[PDB]
Design a protein around this ligand. Structure first.
Ligand code: CLA
Ligand code: CLA
Ligand code: CLA
Ligand code: CLA
Ligand code: CLA
Ligand code: CLA
Ligand code: CLA
Ligand code: CLA
Ligand code: CLA
Ligand SMILES: CC1=C(/C=C/C(C)=C/C=C/C(C)=C\C=C\C=C(C)\C=C\C=C(C)\C=C\C2=C(C)CCCC2(C)C)C(C)(C)CCC1
Ligand code: SF4
Lengths: 136, 74, 75, 31, 45, 61, 75, 80, 141
């Protein structure tokens, strides 16, 4: 599914546990101009390869911490995948193809409230109704 | 500090004269204020138009004995 | 570091100065078993001259526990 | 509203007068 | 002396003015209790 | 609401509700909260500017 | 470290420090009570904290009154 | 998951999207501010609830709010 | 008054404590002059002077004279601090003047602080003592 070389480190005990085989698993891919040393989110030092890299991780936050670190190495082509135990690989970051800090067309407003927050109703007005005060 | 330094007479000791007044208003003779129920000439003692405070001798007997917790001396 | 060593040296020479001027050190040398080491005479203001206890050697003051007296006798 | 504040100071003066009455029993002015 | 203006602005800072002013106040109280001790109340004629 | 005019906040959720601020600039783009107001007091985040609407301000003169 | 210095205090007072008679027998300060009392928490509370703090609470009006004041102010 | 909602006092300074450690937030086109952009929260299932976006928000009380809700494996941040 | 109060001159316990009297200061007669001052107070059964704070003028030196003296000094202090804070708000570097005092502003203010009751009455009657409730900040209800 995913093409890449595992970075060079002698293994840690901070890697990925039984949740990977039973619940969900993440992968990060990036390419590097040269081979250089980076820090794992699990702890420890590892050498990335000159070329395509692949590093399986337990949480998505590990991949976004690593992708924030890879920007210091001037590497902005990183991709984060979500892998299920069925083998289902889905592409989540960046999902649109553009990083979320930049505006891209085709994105819609999700969970936008067209009022200020002091204009939310009282909790007693929404009591027993099954809705929250901040809904809609 | 003043008791630690061997001089306990330099303490700030304040009498609770208001709650002692209330105890003297109930007939407690120990403070010597001679007020409402501790004063036998008072209108509250005699209940002047009707004289029907039947509770009062047993009450003063109970409050003026020092052998109970009924308005302890403060 | 030099400023801090200056602080520690002021502290040390101050302890030695209290042993010089305000102590029963010479009375302690004559009888180490029956004289309690004391520097720091306390000024009498608010009844705190009770703290100047009879430590022996004809002296009244706070009995010290740092062992400067034993250090100086060993010196 | 009410720049003399005549209602709230009526009850405040009444409570203060009951206070002076209890104090007048305290200092044995009224017996 | 321009350095004297710097020293006056140093004395006028909060911890230094605090230690000077509270040292003066504590000294007044300490000296008054040296010369006139043991005033639990004001004595009356 | 003019630039440089002292105003008072009528937004209840704000840090500076019923407190005097100074107008920095007003946007004419038809946006909902155009008036940039500056304050001497900083809020709990350490910020002393906020965007306000015209309805959330009264002039202080 | 509080348990370390409590161990030192009660072990040295119970099993080491004390007076020597001319016959040679040693009478310790707390009398050898460390062996049977220090094995319970009640024994610590009673024979160490309750029993040995008799001197800091009964010290108002003596030269040791500042230590009673510091005991309360530290609490 | 937690609920992240964006109110209309946004100025589009994109700081919440940058602060977010789990990619919940993104910037979308808009016309109610000068920067012509709001923040949007499509991936609230990745939200751990750490509120760095609320720390990052410059408006006087918070164009963005996180309302802590039900807990999942992702929202609790478990690697196991 | 209450709970066995006698004058200190008549109490045997006070005169028993007066013999063994510690000296507060360096002069040898501090312990004697202490009880000679305290002899005019009322005395509990153990020998200690009990103060009476109800407000009569027989015992005014127990609490009324320290009350007037404290209220004068504390009103001085608080009034002077208020006047200094109001003095430095017009200077546009007000936060720097709170950690670094202006002596040229503060020292006339502490000099003029003897008339704080007159100034406080003149500011209460003028209406400048307080701010309006609509002009100061509050929280959402
Ligand atoms: C205003 C609130 C208040 C106050 C006054 C107290 C008062 C007290 N608590 Mg306390 N407590 C409170 C709220 C309070 N509690 C609450 C809400 C809780 C939670 C339930 C507790 C829980 C609690 C515990 C767990 C303990 C206390 C204890 C104590 C006592 C220790 C102080 C003492 O003996 O006097 C102080 C006496 C002195 C003689 C001090 C004088 C010291 C020096 C000589 C003078 C200092 C002046 C000088 C200017 C300062 C030095 C400056 C220097 C740096 C240069 C005291 C009776 C302790 C105690 O003793 O229990 C037995 C204790 O351990 N309390
Ligand atoms: C906010 C402060 C406050 C509070 C909550 C209490 C509460 C109490 N006091 Mg009290 N008291 C206070 C201040 C206070 N006192 C002051 C400042 C004094 C003067 C030293 C006293 C003197 C005092 C005596 C003599 C007695 C009590 C007693 C009591 C208890 C019963 C109720 C009562 O008699 O009220 C009395 C309260 C007052 C007379 C004053 C009310 C507080 C005022 C309004 C605040 C402003 C006072 C002001 C600073 C005075 C300046 C003095 C100057 C004008 C000369 C109760 C626990 C009684 C007791 O021991 O019960 C067992 C008791 O006999 N108090
Ligand atoms: C560093 C250790 C140290 C310590 C803890 C002390 C402690 C003490 N010394 Mg001492 N002393 C020391 C070093 C020390 N000294 C040294 C190095 C010398 C030799 C110069 C002396 C010479 C000395 C003498 C000659 C005497 C003392 C005395 C005293 C006692 C009272 C001091 C006092 O009230 O000051 C009063 C403190 C002040 C007035 C503080 C002023 C604060 C200013 C305003 C701060 C300035 C800050 C800013 C820059 C402005 C006190 C126990 C006296 C005593 O009776 O001892 C038994 C005494 O007569 N000391
Ligand atoms: C309200 C009651 C009261 C009052 C008025 C006092 C007042 C006093 N007590 Mg006292 N005391 C009290 C309660 C009280 N106490 C209580 C309750 C207790 C029992 C716990 C005691 C126990 C007690 C003892 C045991 C002693 C005092 C002493 C003193 C006196 C001097 C304070 C002192 O040593 O300063 C200390 C000041 C210094 C050490 C100097 C200040 C430091 C200078 C400024 C330099 C430091 C900074 C500088 C920059 C460093 C240089 C570094 C370099 C790089 C430049 C003072 C008169 C002492 C005394 O009598 O003096 C002989 C003393 O030994 N008190
Ligand atoms: C408050 C007065 C006071 C002063 C100035 C001293 C001073 C001293 N004592 Mg002493 N002592 C006191 C009270 C005092 N003691 C009391 C109440 C007792 C109980 C009876 C004792 C019992 C005692 C014994 C048993 C012994 C001493 C010893 C000493 C010396 C050790 C130096 C020292 O203090 O450590 C230095 C301390 C520090 C560096 C830490 C103190 C932290 C700061 C500097 C103090 C607070 C500063 C300031 C007031 C706080 C406000 C500032 C803050 C808000 C920023 C020195 C001469 C020993 C000695 O060798 O005698 C010569 C010794 O054996 N003292
Ligand atoms: C409006 C201001 C005011 C004034 C002038 C007084 C005046 C008085 N109060 Mg008082 N008091 C007030 C407000 C006031 N109170 C408030 C607001 C409360 C509620 C907390 C109390 C609660 C209170 C209690 C609980 C007690 C007093 C007592 C007293 C009397 C004792 C003072 C005295 O003998 O000095 C002479 C008169 C000087 C004005 C005195 C008549 C005491 C009293 O009446 O004892 C019998 C008493 O125990 N007061
Ligand atoms: C601002 C506080 C303050 C004030 C008002 C005073 C006031 C006084 N001090 Mg004093 N003093 C202070 C701080 C203060 N002191 C400090 C901090 C120290 C420690 C260094 C001393 C050490 C001191 C000594 C050693 C002597 C005075 C003496 C005097 C008196 C001077 C009498 C005379 O002839 O001139 C006077 C009451 C003298 C006095 O009258 O005592 C007999 C005296 O001999 N003071
Ligand atoms: C808030 C509580 C409180 C109160 C009401 C008092 C009240 C008092 N204390 Mg006290 N004290 C307190 C806390 C308190 N203290 C604490 C916390 C401690 C431990 C550090 C002590 C330790 C202590 C001691 C060791 C001594 C006192 C003394 C005194 C008496 C003051 C004598 C004096 O100088 O007056 C006269 C003051 C003035 C005339 C003020 C003059 C100020 C200026 C110059 C006037 C300007 C005119 C305008 C008075 C009864 C002393 C006393 O006499 O014993 C009864 C005394 O020896 N106290
Ligand atoms: C300018 C000085 C000043 C003045 C006039 C006031 C006035 C007031 N304060 Mg206060 N306050 C101050 C400083 C001051 N504060 C500071 C510095 C603090 C931080 C410690 C506080 C903390 C504080 C609390 C926590 C509370 C008040 C409250 C109050 C109110 C009731 C009176 C009271 O509790 O006083 C007593 C105040 C204190 C014991 C705090 C310490 C006061 C310091 C020692 C005095 C400051 C001196 C000043 C720096 C000198 C400036 C001189 C200038 C020329 C350089 C009253 C409006 C109460 C309130 O809201 O009631 C409605 C209340 O709950 N204040
Ligand atoms: C006589 C007497 C008494 C009584 C008393 C009383 C009871 C009173 C009350 C009182 C009261 C009940 C009062 C109230 C008040 C109120 C108010 C309203 C006030 C306020 C004030 C102010 C506001 C302040 C200001 C200031 C100044 C003045 C200065 C400084 C600064 C300041 C700002 C702080 C007793 C028994 C104790 C004792 C004996 C005697
Ligand atoms: S709470 Fe955390 S994960 Fe959620 S939107 Fe804020 S910064 Fe992102």
């Amino acid at each position: 599914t995913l093409s890449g070389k595992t970075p060079l480190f002698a293994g840690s005990t901070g890697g990925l546990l039984t949740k990977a085989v039973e619940e969900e698993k993440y992968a990060i891919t990036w390419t590097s101009p040269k081979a250089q040393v980076f820090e794992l989110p699990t702890g420890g030092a590892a050498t990335m390869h000159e070329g395509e890299n692949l590093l399986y991780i337990a949480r998505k936050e590990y991949g976004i911490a690593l992708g924030g670190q890879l920007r210091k190495f001037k590497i902005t082509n990183y991709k984060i995948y979500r892998i299920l135990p069925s083998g289902e690989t889905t592409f989540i970051h960046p999902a649109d193809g553009v990083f979320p800090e930049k505006v891209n067309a085709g994105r819609e407003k999700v969970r936008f409230n067209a009022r200020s927050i002091g204009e939310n109703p009282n909790p007693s007005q929404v009591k027993f109704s099954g809705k929250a005060t901040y809904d809609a | 500090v003043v008791v630690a330094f061997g001089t306990p007479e330099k303490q700030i000791l304040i009498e609770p004269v208001f709650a002692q007044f209330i105890q003297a208003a109930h007939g407690k003779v120990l403070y010597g204020l001679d007020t409402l129920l501790s004063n036998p000439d008072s209108v509250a003692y005699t209940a002047y138009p009707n004289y029907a405070n039947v509770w009062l001798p047993g009450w003063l007997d109970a409050i003026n004995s020092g052998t109970n917790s009924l308005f302890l001396t403060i | 570091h030099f400023g801090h060593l200056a602080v520690v040296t002021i502290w040390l020479s101050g302890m030695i100065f209290h042993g010089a001027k305000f102590s029963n050190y010479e009375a302690w040398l004559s009888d180490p078993l029956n004289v309690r080491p004391s520097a720091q005479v306390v000024w009498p203001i608010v009844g705190q001259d009770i703290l100047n206890g009879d430590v022996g050697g004809g002296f009244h003051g706070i009995q010290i526990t740092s062992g400067l007296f034993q250090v100086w006798r060993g010196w | 509203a009410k720049p003399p504040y005549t209602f709230r100071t009526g009850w405040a003066l009444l409570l203060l007068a009951v206070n002076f009455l209890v104090a007048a029993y305290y200092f044995h002015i009224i017996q | 002396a321009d350095q004297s203006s710097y020293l006056i602005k140093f004395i006028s800072t909060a911890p230094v003015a605090a230690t000077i002013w509270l040292t003066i106040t504590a000294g007044i109280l300490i000296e008054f209790n040296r010369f006139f001790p043991d005033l639990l109340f004001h004595p009356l004629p | 609401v003019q630039r440089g005019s002292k105003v008072r906040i009528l937004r209840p959720e704000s840090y500076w509700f019923q407190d005097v601020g100074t107008v920095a600039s007003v946007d004419q783009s038809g946006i909902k909260y155009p008036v940039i107001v500056r304050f001497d007091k900083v809020n709990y985040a350490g910020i002393n500017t906020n965007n306000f609407a015209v309805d959330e301000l009264i002039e202080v003169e | 470290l509080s348990i370390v210095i409590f161990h030192f205090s009660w072990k040295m007072q119970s099993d080491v420090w004390g007076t020597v008679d001319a016959a040679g027998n040693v009478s310790h300060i707390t009398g050898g009570n460390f062996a049977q009392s220090a094995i319970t928490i009640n024994g610590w509370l009673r024979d160490f904290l309750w029993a040995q703090a008799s001197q800091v609470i009964n010290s108002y009006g003596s030269a040791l009154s500042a230590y009673g004041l510091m005991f309360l102010g530290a609490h | 998951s937690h609920t992240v909602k964006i109110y209309d006092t946004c100025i589009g300074c994109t700081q919440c999207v940058r602060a977010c450690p789990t990619d919940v937030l993104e910037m979308v086109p808009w016309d109610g501010c000068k920067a012509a952009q709001v923040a949007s929260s499509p991936r609230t299932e990745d939200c751990v609830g750490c509120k760095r976006c609320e720390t990052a928000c410059p408006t006087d009380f918070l164009s963005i709010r996180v309302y802590l809700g039900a807990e999942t494996t992702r929202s609790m941040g478990l690697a196991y | 008054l209450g709970a066995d109060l006698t004058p200190c001159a008549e109490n045997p316990a006070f005169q028993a404590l007066a013999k063994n009297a510690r000296n507060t200061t360096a002069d040898p007669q501090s312990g004697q002059k202490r009880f000679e001052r305290y002899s005019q107070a009322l005395c509990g059964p153990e020998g200690y002077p009990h103060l009476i704070v109800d407000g009569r003028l027989d015992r005014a030196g127990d609490f009324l004279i320290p009350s007037i003296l404290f209220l004068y000094i504390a009103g001085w202090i608080g009034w002077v601090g208020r006047a200094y804070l109001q003095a430095i708000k017009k200077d546009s570097d007000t936060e720097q003047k709170e950690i670094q005092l202006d002596l040229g502003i503060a020292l006339p203010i502490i000099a003029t602080g003897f008339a704080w009751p007159a100034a406080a009455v003149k500011e209460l009657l003028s209406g400048e003592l307080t701010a309006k409730d609509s002009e100061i900040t509050v929280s959402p209800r």
